[PDB]
Design a protein around this nucleic acid. Structure first.
Lengths: 168, 168
RNA sequence: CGCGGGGUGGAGCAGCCUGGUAGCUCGUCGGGCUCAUAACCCGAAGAUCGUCGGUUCAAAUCCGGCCCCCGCAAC
RNA sequence: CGCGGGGUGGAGCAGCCUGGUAGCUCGUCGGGCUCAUAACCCGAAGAUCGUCGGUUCAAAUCCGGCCCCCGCAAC
């Protein structure tokens, strides 16, 4: 099952290793208080085992971006404010032992489900992500992430309405 | 009871009248698609009557602000990003017939409860509000809203931890 | 769904209304005729009709979802 | 809770460790003495110990939550 971090963590963190080093450091170093200080929410894809074998995680932090980053002025005439409510997908990683099996997209989908249940609360438009990787940018575009073109040139977006349609 | 807008609205909107005109226009004019386009979420304080007597409402839109707006550099050393996850309390109003009875604060508290349940999802820090009214700024400071001093000089803030402590 | 219009060679228009059919003016190029040409005559290429779906033996055409562009009232 | 220090007249320090007590140097001002003064002698004011709580007959002092400030490693 997929689950958020409990109050008592009791996770095994060192034997985990995703692809990129920077994300390993983000896991080992910055995540603890950022979760406890309610900077972001971390969701964990684990085996539900006693060892809590760590194989995936993702981070969600609400955010804003310049409205001009939208590609279509038609969508701009729909939003009456200079800033756009967004949720930044801060980081997303799966252990290397499972890469090439689509669990990346499964995590993105669970995150979209959570963002949908959240849209019931503060009604933001979808998922913002600033993908440094080129593979990540193309991988997101494969799932249909809208490229945001503005002062930022590396972000991809996913609308709330597409999330509604995905869950029928 | 307090409730969000259903799919079928069936509300009585004209006989409602809050204090400020601008908010009346925001209600009559911009709210419909902003709810339907998932720009924000509107919560309604109604009598649960057949007429759906409208006496209060508030709007929530996730947002960001410059980190330098925080008053204490101590809290700045806690947040490792230039932008801070926030939820903007876009608008808040109660019908004039009930002003001076504290339902303003009751709505703020229900909104805080919702932001708490949301903090379980994207872990933002609390409530951002840009209060044009001076009465509103002082009224928020009475409930303990932290004034944000930065490029913006009119916003007030409420942390997530205070919300946790309020609900015991 | 704020009101309304619109989607097609490279550009700009008609083809609908009325299901079966790719048309017109520029532009490109080829050819013919001229001392010669952006001028005159002839010819060729490029759009599969914004995308997706439905009905139909068949769809640019009728119907629905969505996308995009333009003007205006509001921000 | 990244590591560590710190909170007190207007500024900078000690008072803890050891519960009962407001102290020192500047600064302000008043007075005395000088041709006179920031110089010498005397005196006064201003902090209720960051905030909140707990224990105690009693708290700056012990204990807890929180707030704020400084340095450094990281961003």
């Amino acid at each position: 099952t997929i689950e958020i971090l409990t109050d008592d963590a009791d996770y095994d963190l060192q034997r985990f290793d995703c692809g990129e080093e920077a994300l390993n450091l983000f896991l080992t170093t910055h995540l603890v208080r950022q979760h406890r200080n309610k900077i972001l929410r971390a969701y964990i894809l684990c085996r539900n085992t006693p060892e809590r074998q760590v194989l995936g995680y993702y981070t969600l932090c609400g955010s804003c971006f310049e409205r001009a980053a939208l590609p279509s002025k038609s969508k701009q005439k729909k939003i009456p404010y200079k800033n756009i409510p967004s949720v930044t997908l801060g980081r997303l990683a799966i252990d290397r032992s499972l890469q090439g099996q689509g669990w990346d997209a499964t995590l993105v989908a669970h995150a979209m489900n959570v963002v949908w249940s959240a849209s019931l609360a503060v009604g933001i438009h979808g998922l913002f992500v600033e993908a440094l990787n080129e593979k990540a940018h193309t991988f997101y575009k494969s799932l249909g992430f809208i490229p945001l073109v503005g002062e930022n040139e590396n972000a991809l977006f996913f609308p709330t309405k597409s999330i509604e349609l995905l869950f029928t």
